[PDB]
Design goal:
The complex is a heterodimer of chains A (105) and B (37).
Chain A: H1 2-8, H2 12-23, H3 25-32, H4 37-50, H5 55-71, H6 79-91, H7 93-104
Helix pairs in contact in A: 1-5, 2-4, 2-5, 6-7
Chain B: H1 3-21, H2 23-36
The chains are: A mainly alpha (105), B mainly alpha (37).
Chain lengths: 105, 37
Amino acid sequence: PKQKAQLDELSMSEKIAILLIQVGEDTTGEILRHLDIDSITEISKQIVQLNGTDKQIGAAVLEEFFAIFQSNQYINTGGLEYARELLTRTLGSEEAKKVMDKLTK
Amino acid sequence: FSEEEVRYEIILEKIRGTLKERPDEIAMLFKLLIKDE
């Protein structure tokens, strides 16, 4: 509940730094090299400040970005896991699994 | 390797792959997402 509260008050810039922290330094360096200085300043600041965020909050952030990349076609694989996340949000864990079993077949 | 840990690794690997694939586009996506809010 506290995690949830903390997750819904993250700015989009905080969510992006949390995403970057989880993808690691090499991939983060690749994004930062294409940003402007003011963007790099803000994101770098949150990486340093959000280092060590709860992994469950990070996972919720990744799921949020997973849905963004699915709906905008940056990611065109892993539809099963996307369905699993969607059905769990809309139906709850236990009815989603019965859909998921029928969905895999 | 719980189901949760494995599912986490599924989306992380695909998100990492997308960032590596087109870093300039994701960088601008991030700028646009920030400016949106």
